[PDB]
Amino acid sequence: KLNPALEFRDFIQVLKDEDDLIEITEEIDPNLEVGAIMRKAYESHLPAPLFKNLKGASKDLFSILGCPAGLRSKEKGDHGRIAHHLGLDPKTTIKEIIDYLLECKEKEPLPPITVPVSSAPCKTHILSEEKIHLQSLPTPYLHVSDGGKYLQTYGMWILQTPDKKWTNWSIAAGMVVDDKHITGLVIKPQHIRQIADSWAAIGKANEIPFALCFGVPPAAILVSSMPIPEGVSESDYVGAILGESVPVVKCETNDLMVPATSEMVFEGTLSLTDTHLEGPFGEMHGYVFKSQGHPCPLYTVKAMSYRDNAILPVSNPGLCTDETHTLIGSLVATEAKELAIESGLPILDAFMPYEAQALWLILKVDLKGLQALKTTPEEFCKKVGDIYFRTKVGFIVHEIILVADDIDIFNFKEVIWAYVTRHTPVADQMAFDDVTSFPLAPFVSQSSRSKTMKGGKCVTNCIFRQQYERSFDYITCNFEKGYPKGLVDKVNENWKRYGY
Amino acid sequence: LNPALEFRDFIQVLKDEDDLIEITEEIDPNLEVGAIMRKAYESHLPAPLFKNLKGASKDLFSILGCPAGLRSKEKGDHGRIAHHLGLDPKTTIKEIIDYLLECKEKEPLPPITVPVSSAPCKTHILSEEKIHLQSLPTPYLHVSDGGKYLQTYGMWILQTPDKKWTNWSIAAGMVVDDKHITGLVIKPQHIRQIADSWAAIGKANEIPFALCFGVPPAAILVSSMPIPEGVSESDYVGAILGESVPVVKCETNDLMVPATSEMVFEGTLSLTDTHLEGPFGEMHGYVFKSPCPLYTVKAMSYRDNAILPVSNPGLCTDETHTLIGSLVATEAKELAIESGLPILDAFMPYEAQALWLILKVDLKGLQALKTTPEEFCKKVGDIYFRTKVGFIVHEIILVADDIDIFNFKEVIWAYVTRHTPVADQMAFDDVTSFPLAPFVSQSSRSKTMKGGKCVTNCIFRQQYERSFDYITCNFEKGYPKGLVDKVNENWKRYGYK
Ligand SMILES: Cc1cc2c3c(c1C)C(C)(C)CC=[N+]3c1c([nH]c(=O)[nH]c1=O)N2C[C@H](O)[C@H](O)[C@H](O)COP(=O)(O)O
Ligand SMILES: Cc1cc2c3c(c1C)C(C)(C)CC=[N+]3c1c([nH]c(=O)[nH]c1=O)N2C[C@H](O)[C@H](O)[C@H](O)COP(=O)(O)O
Ligand SMILES: [K+]
Ligand SMILES: [Mn+2]
Ligand SMILES: [Mn+2]
Ligand SMILES: [Mn+2]
């Protein structure tokens, strides 16, 4: 019996059973080759590559699994890979996946369970400080012009507060610096930064304990990507999704708990006072820019542990569609739907289209609910923007687009139609000048707005004026919706006989 | 086969390409014609030729639908459009546009009168009391249309009182009763400009016209193109064809009609005698439940087994996008060259329902102007939105020369990643609005008819000044060609099926 949500290796096996994984046995260079193969597979929605013979590898360190949450063909279920991180039927839609995650918020949180070390495959091999050699690993060089090799693209950073009440799991990119050090972005408003600032506040900025875990339970890596509330430990919600506690063991060199079935675990201390230049790194909007960036904190690795024949999962970001659109975007959408429900807005669904590179959040609006409020477009846009852009859930989003409930927001052909035909350029767009800008957006990073970090965000009204007051019946001029059902069925029936 | 010159040769070349289905079973012109057309358009399928319409006579008529719809890439996807011009069927939309511009530099060839005996449009001739427009199997195209639309891919002919300008153009035309048709006749369209000349000398109620169906395909393409005022479209159609269009006189007035037209209607137009028109399903995808001039039909002439060509507008992609959009883009490129802007290409993406005009900028030419985003956006908007060529266009989008503007994947990528919402958009408040845009028609801007247009800057600030090298993070552009080729070569050996 396979349990893909609880075991990374069972997740591999079910993708094999669905012919959605290719074991590549010939020699592949971690320098560019891995990365280009991944981009080709993401962009035509093809099977996930599993590289078994990397140039420079040892028997144990490591294989690479690329594209762990890319899209695949509609026949097998196109979001199948996502659905298997949650233990759901491979044909489940992304609307359904979202509404499942919201149901699991109502279930009892189950905290992790400690198990004996001999039951943790992550403890099979252990390396102390003098045996750590990060430059000897077959780490990938993923994009032309990247500043280094990125070991950490699909692992889980684990940090805990000084008072021990909140342990955080999240994903952020991590670059190998030298034989013992990794560096990466630690920016507001992310929780990794909030926890580090709390270590600085009690005098320990140069010695923050961390763990970095690869090939965790798939449900854990997906909740690592999700912006749940401050103070809530990811592990307890992951337990609710699994229906059982995640099994964990303690680190060798600190008090943190790591999943027992991890492929690889790195441990150490993070310093906010000892910094290094990071990047460049190809990013979720499709670009490598040569900008040297701010200097970033340094992670010092002091121990590692791993399984026999260990597998590193990898994400290679860029043009749609990859994990930075299917996870970051759809998990912002999950929490955006939750926020509409708690603040009383009449939203049926939310979604971040892949074609818009996770910059556009579409809200599908219930028209009876909207009419009950007896409001105007100007007041509704302000209320919505104030809810979303002044909170952490809104951070990556630069344009919020409001459409009526006759639009399938999960179909980008319906969304681009409503966008160009139902909003007046400029006049139907409300600017928010004083809110936090998203620094990765290229129109921000490559402007003066990078110095100031405020504004450039908008709410765009694609709801007709009459739709705020009452019913408004119009015909949509295509085959499926423009003609009555009986005629559609008759044309579909006689299609062959006509001569097609 | 000369498909640019003969409508029946166009139908045959489509037969030879398996791009035409002769439908022989009985089909109702009430909704069924329309629905079949929509299904064909939307999956880029072969054009339906309806041979046995309920209510038809032997001669009046069949319907060809989807004459400038898209087809499979294997056959050439703009093949139908290339055939209107006599070009190879795999010619790209880029090459089609550039061909139309090269044809502006050839010598115009005015029409040539031929004998009435050699002219098929004269095979059958009806006099005034033999006109019965309600006995034609005219299509009822969209649910909630305000009536039956006979004129959707025919050619209106109007001439100035001095005889020096003959205009050919397309505009929708709805049957009102047994003798009368009504259509939109609006500024700034040449048909309104010419009608107003007749009103100015006291003949607003008796303007001669003709209406022709199944014209030479090159003529129906130019009829949809905004060429300059006072140029008779016939003369440029001649330059395109490499010969004069062959024409014959109308029975009841002095206008000349193409000799091979399937059907010709003749009469007088009145601007002061109005009737309710519409609603009609339109180029942006809607019928809304929301008073135009009257055309009096006084004579008709037609071929044996005549064929009415039909366009049914709606969602992308149909003739309102492949012709109206691309021919605005053709004239938009001509205006850039004439005004001196650094534009390599222009296109109106079909996905944006012909509301978006994308302009591909040459960065060395832009850098040579020593300008800013604010000043360039003003310069571009002032050229386009204040002239007839910019009439349908509500957003102009400026991109650099690394974007293929003919591929909508790269357009939407550039759009969302390279402009700051609002701050990088310049509103034009005092220019004329397109009254068909749904955001205009369903707001109080329907009554003012000004504003709601903008130029959106999608060129990075540094690209106005100098080189700017970044990597595009996909497979074919992100990696060296050698490595791209190596991966493609070994793809099957890895295990991909
Ligand atoms: C799935 C995923 C999420 C990335 C991500 C990537 C992936 C594959 C990469 C590694 C390919 C590239 C860039 N990533 C970063 C990122 N957030 C961040 O602060 N820095 C990052 O470097 N994220 C988002 C981050 O995981 C979410 O915002 C979480 O909500 C953070 O958790 P938190 O709410 O506990 O802070
Ligand atoms: C190809 C095509 C073009 C339509 C058109 C359609 C098609 C199929 C229809 C019939 C399906 C629906 C609506 N159309 C109208 C329209 N222009 C207009 O003034 N009224 C219209 O009703 N046009 C565009 C018109 O032909 C262009 O604006 C020309 O440039 C007009 O020529 P002009 O420069 O000589 O005035
Ligand atoms: K998280
Ligand atoms: Mn968190
Ligand atoms: Mn004209
Ligand atoms: Mn014309």
Side-chain angles (χ1 to χ4, degrees), chain A residues 2-58 60-73 76-291 293-450 452-468 470-495 497-500, chain B residues 1-57 59-73 75-183 185-373 375-492 494-496:
Chain A
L2 300 176
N3 192 336
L6 183 74
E7 301 273 5
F8 183 71
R9 286 185 183 195
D10 292 7
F11 169 85
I12 290 166
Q13 195 60 60
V14 56
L15 300 182
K16 267 180 219 193
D17 300 348
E18 292 171 338
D19 304 301
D20 189 38
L21 187 136
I22 307 308
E23 297 167 75
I24 306 185
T25 58
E26 66 190 77
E27 177 181 285
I28 301 299
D29 200 338
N31 184 22
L32 299 179
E33 234 161 60
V34 162
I37 283 165
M38 292 173 59
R39 295 313 315 182
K40 184 185 173 82
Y42 285 122
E43 291 152 22
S44 303
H45 301 194
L46 301 178
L50 168 50
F51 308 88
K52 296 274 265 270
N53 180 23
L54 293 168
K55 196 181 163 200
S58 71
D60 293 327
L61 295 172
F62 38 70
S63 297
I64 287 175
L65 178 70
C67 317
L71 296 187
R72 68 192 194 175
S73 67
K76 302 182 177 180
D78 55 0
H79 294 252
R81 283 183 215 155
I82 297 88
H84 290 311
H85 284 76
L86 299 179
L88 300 166
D89 178 314
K91 287 162 212 290
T92 318
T93 66
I94 186 72
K95 172 169 162 50
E96 289 168 335
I97 288 155
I98 291 169
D99 299 339
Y100 188 61
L101 291 161
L102 302 175
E103 274 153 49
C104 294
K105 285 176 182 281
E106 296 306 328
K107 292 166 188 192
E108 191 215 355
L110 294 183
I113 187 168
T114 304
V115 301
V117 289
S118 71
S119 301
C122 85
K123 304 293 211 188
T124 309
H125 294 100
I126 292 165
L127 296 179
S128 72
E129 198 293 323
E130 83 135 357
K131 308 297 153 107
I132 305 292
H133 293 291
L134 307 172
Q135 321 232 242
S136 79
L137 300 171
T139 305
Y141 184 73
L142 284 171
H143 318 256
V144 166
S145 275
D146 279 353
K149 308 184 188 190
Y150 276 73
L151 177 57
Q152 161 48 345
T153 60
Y154 208 71
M156 185 172 98
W157 293 111
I158 298 174
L159 276 86
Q160 178 178 104
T161 47
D163 70 0
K164 293 175 276 152
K165 303 333 289 247
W166 174 29
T167 300
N168 202 259
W169 297 354
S170 49
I171 302 180
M175 191 188 90
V176 179
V177 165
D178 67 23
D179 220 35
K180 319 287 202 193
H181 297 95
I182 288 156
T183 193
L185 289 166
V186 189
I187 62 174
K188 308 196 165 188
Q190 300 293 69
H191 290 160
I192 190 168
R193 181 54 182 292
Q194 190 172 332
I195 293 182
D197 286 350
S198 91
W199 285 81
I202 62 144
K204 300 194 159 161
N206 183 257
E207 258 190 326
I208 304 160
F210 78 90
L212 171 60
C213 300
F214 296 103
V216 297
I221 200 68
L222 169 156
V223 176
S224 302
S225 189
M226 188 169 180
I228 69 181
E230 67 171 304
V232 179
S233 290
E234 278 84 357
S235 64
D236 307 345
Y237 183 46
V238 172
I241 293 155
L242 298 169
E244 62 176 291
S245 302
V246 174
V248 293
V249 294
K250 196 181 71 75
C251 282
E252 299 297 309
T253 68
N254 61 47
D255 305 311
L256 303 168
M257 303 313 281
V258 301
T261 59
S262 310
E263 298 285 321
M264 296 188 269
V265 174
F266 300 78
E267 18 175 311
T269 56
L270 160 64
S271 179
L272 303 172
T273 65
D274 186 17
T275 65
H276 197 281
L277 284 173
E278 179 275 341
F281 190 48
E283 126 282 39
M284 72 189 283
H285 304 113
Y287 303 82
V288 188
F289 290 120
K290 285 140 51 186
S291 310
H294 277 242
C296 291
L298 272 173
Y299 298 88
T300 300
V301 172
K302 293 171 170 177
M304 194 200 167
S305 79
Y306 59 92
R307 295 184 81 130
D308 289 308
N309 315 291
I311 301 168
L312 179 78
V314 174
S315 179
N316 189 21
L319 263 293
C320 69
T321 300
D322 64 58
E323 290 77 26
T324 70
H325 320 114
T326 61
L327 303 181
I328 301 187
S330 301
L331 295 165
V332 162
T334 305
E335 290 290 353
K337 192 172 165 180
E338 181 74 339
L339 192 55
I341 290 168
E342 288 163 4
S343 49
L345 299 173
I347 305 311
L348 295 161
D349 286 299
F351 190 62
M352 298 205 81
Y354 311 141
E355 299 89 345
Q357 300 289 323
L359 284 155
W360 280 14
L361 179 61
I362 317 311
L363 305 183
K364 177 173 190 181
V365 176
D366 173 328
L367 293 177
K368 285 191 198 310
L370 176 60
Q371 294 157 9
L373 295 170
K374 298 180 282 157
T375 183
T376 68
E378 212 215 303
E379 291 161 327
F380 196 59
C381 291
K382 179 151 140 55
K383 189 181 187 198
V384 170
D386 285 336
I387 287 162
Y388 288 102
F389 293 145
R390 305 185 179 288
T391 205
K392 176 170 177 291
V393 166
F395 178 59
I396 73 166
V397 180
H398 267 263
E399 187 157 351
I400 294 174
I401 295 159
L402 310 172
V403 297
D405 51 33
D406 66 342
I407 298 308
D408 184 3
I409 68 172
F410 304 95
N411 184 353
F412 197 61
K413 297 160 181 279
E414 290 188 37
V415 174
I416 187 75
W417 180 57
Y419 187 80
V420 310
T421 65
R422 307 180 186 186
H423 98 268
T424 310
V426 184
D428 285 326
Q429 295 179 65
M430 182 178 275
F432 283 79
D433 305 310
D434 56 336
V435 306
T436 304
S437 301
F438 183 39
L440 265 46
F443 54 79
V444 172
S445 68
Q446 310 303 122
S447 69
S448 65
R449 195 181 311 274
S450 62
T452 82
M453 311 194 52
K454 292 198 141 55
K457 284 197 180 203
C458 109
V459 182
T460 293
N461 176 47
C462 297
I463 289 173
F464 292 121
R465 188 70 192 70
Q466 194 175 328
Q467 290 174 329
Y468 286 75
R470 65 206 172 76
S471 78
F472 173 31
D473 308 322
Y474 53 69
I475 300 295
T476 296
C477 296
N478 69 16
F479 174 58
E480 299 81 29
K481 301 166 166 185
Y483 298 90
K485 185 200 189 313
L487 176 55
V488 161
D489 287 346
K490 188 191 181 178
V491 172
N492 285 336
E493 267 181 62
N494 293 317
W495 206 245
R497 180 172 77 206
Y498 297 159
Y500 295 87
Chain B
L1 292 183
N2 195 343
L5 179 67
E6 302 279 341
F7 179 69
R8 295 205 175 182
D9 290 19
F10 176 82
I11 288 163
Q12 184 57 45
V13 57
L14 296 195
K15 268 168 198 185
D16 304 337
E17 288 164 358
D18 308 316
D19 191 31
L20 196 133
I21 307 301
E22 303 205 53
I23 308 190
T24 74
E25 88 184 62
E26 164 168 305
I27 296 292
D28 200 335
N30 186 2
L31 299 178
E32 288 187 10
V33 159
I36 291 165
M37 287 175 68
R38 289 320 310 185
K39 187 192 164 67
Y41 280 130
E42 287 151 32
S43 303
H44 299 186
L45 301 173
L49 176 57
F50 306 90
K51 285 282 261 224
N52 166 26
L53 293 176
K54 160 162 186 158
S57 68
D59 292 319
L60 298 173
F61 35 67
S62 304
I63 287 163
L64 177 67
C66 310
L70 295 185
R71 66 197 199 183
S72 62
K73 256 180 278 294
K75 308 193 170 174
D77 59 6
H78 298 251
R80 299 209 198 130
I81 301 103
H83 289 319
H84 282 73
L85 301 183
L87 297 168
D88 190 296
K90 297 183 293 204
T91 302
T92 62
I93 188 62
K94 176 164 174 28
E95 291 163 318
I96 290 164
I97 289 162
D98 292 337
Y99 179 72
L100 288 174
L101 301 178
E102 299 159 22
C103 282
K104 282 170 185 288
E105 285 177 301
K106 295 175 195 174
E107 260 234 285
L109 301 179
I112 185 146
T113 294
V114 303
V116 158
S117 69
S118 70
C121 70
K122 294 293 192 177
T123 303
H124 293 94
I125 300 182
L126 306 201
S127 62
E128 196 287 319
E129 35 39 79
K130 298 292 54 148
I131 303 303
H132 297 289
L133 301 178
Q134 311 269 223
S135 81
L136 305 179
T138 309
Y140 184 68
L141 284 169
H142 321 263
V143 172
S144 288
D145 274 349
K148 309 194 194 172
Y149 275 78
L150 183 71
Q151 161 51 337
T152 57
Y153 204 78
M155 186 174 89
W156 296 113
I157 307 179
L158 273 80
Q159 192 177 75
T160 53
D162 70 17
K163 295 192 160 87
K164 303 302 328 293
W165 176 26
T166 298
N167 200 256
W168 295 350
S169 69
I170 304 167
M174 185 188 89
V175 163
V176 179
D177 59 33
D178 222 36
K179 310 285 184 195
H180 291 103
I181 291 163
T182 187
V185 173
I186 55 154
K187 291 129 91 83
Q189 300 292 67
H190 290 168
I191 188 166
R192 172 54 67 173
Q193 189 178 342
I194 286 168
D196 282 348
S197 300
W198 285 89
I201 67 167
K203 301 182 158 170
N205 69 294
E206 49 173 328
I207 302 167
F209 79 97
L211 171 61
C212 303
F213 295 110
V215 297
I220 200 64
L221 185 145
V222 183
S223 299
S224 183
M225 180 167 181
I227 71 173
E229 71 176 325
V231 185
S232 298
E233 278 79 11
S234 64
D235 294 10
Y236 178 55
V237 167
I240 288 169
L241 291 162
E243 60 181 287
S244 290
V245 183
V247 291
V248 285
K249 205 176 73 69
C250 281
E251 296 295 297
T252 72
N253 62 60
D254 291 359
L255 300 174
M256 311 299 296
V257 301
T260 62
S261 311
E262 293 285 310
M263 277 178 289
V264 180
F265 290 82
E266 339 185 343
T268 54
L269 157 73
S270 176
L271 300 169
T272 62
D273 299 64
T274 57
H275 192 280
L276 285 341
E277 177 275 338
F280 188 53
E282 130 303 0
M283 62 188 296
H284 306 120
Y286 303 81
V287 185
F288 300 112
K289 282 120 204 216
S290 316
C292 301
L294 274 173
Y295 294 90
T296 307
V297 181
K298 276 158 191 195
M300 162 173 210
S301 74
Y302 58 94
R303 292 182 82 133
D304 290 311
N305 304 300
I307 302 154
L308 184 69
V310 175
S311 169
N312 186 19
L315 265 287
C316 58
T317 303
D318 65 54
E319 296 67 31
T320 63
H321 314 119
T322 68
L323 304 177
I324 305 179
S326 290
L327 296 169
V328 162
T330 300
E331 291 289 349
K333 179 166 187 189
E334 173 69 19
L335 193 60
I337 297 161
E338 269 288 287
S339 74
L341 294 171
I343 310 303
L344 304 173
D345 284 297
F347 187 61
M348 309 201 62
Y350 313 139
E351 292 87 348
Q353 306 284 331
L355 289 161
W356 281 12
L357 176 69
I358 319 307
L359 294 184
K360 179 184 183 156
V361 178
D362 178 24
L363 295 189
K364 282 200 222 190
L366 177 65
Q367 283 151 27
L369 303 181
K370 307 267 172 67
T371 188
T372 57
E375 298 165 289
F376 197 68
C377 285
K378 186 164 144 67
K379 198 193 165 154
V380 168
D382 282 332
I383 287 168
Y384 289 102
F385 295 146
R386 313 199 175 273
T387 197
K388 170 168 187 288
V389 167
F391 179 58
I392 75 171
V393 180
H394 268 265
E395 187 153 357
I396 292 167
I397 293 158
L398 310 181
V399 298
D401 55 41
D402 72 334
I403 297 305
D404 176 14
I405 65 167
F406 299 106
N407 177 352
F408 197 60
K409 291 173 198 188
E410 299 193 19
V411 174
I412 194 77
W413 175 58
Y415 184 85
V416 310
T417 63
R418 311 190 184 175
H419 96 273
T420 304
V422 186
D424 284 324
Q425 295 176 69
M426 175 179 284
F428 279 71
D429 286 331
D430 64 332
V431 301
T432 300
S433 294
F434 190 32
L436 262 46
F439 54 84
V440 170
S441 76
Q442 308 305 128
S443 68
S444 71
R445 211 185 297 280
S446 57
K447 290 147 149 42
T448 74
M449 307 162 206
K450 282 177 160 78
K453 290 199 176 198
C454 116
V455 173
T456 305
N457 176 55
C458 301
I459 297 169
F460 293 118
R461 191 80 191 61
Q462 190 177 327
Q463 284 167 332
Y464 286 78
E465 306 160 36
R466 66 209 168 94
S467 284
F468 181 34
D469 305 318
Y470 46 78
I471 301 293
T472 300
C473 297
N474 74 354
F475 176 55
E476 286 86 6
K477 311 181 151 212
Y479 292 92
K481 210 198 179 333
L483 175 54
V484 169
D485 284 349
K486 184 193 173 167
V487 169
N488 283 331
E489 209 197 320
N490 293 160
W491 201 240
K492 255 168 59 181
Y494 300 152
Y496 285 96

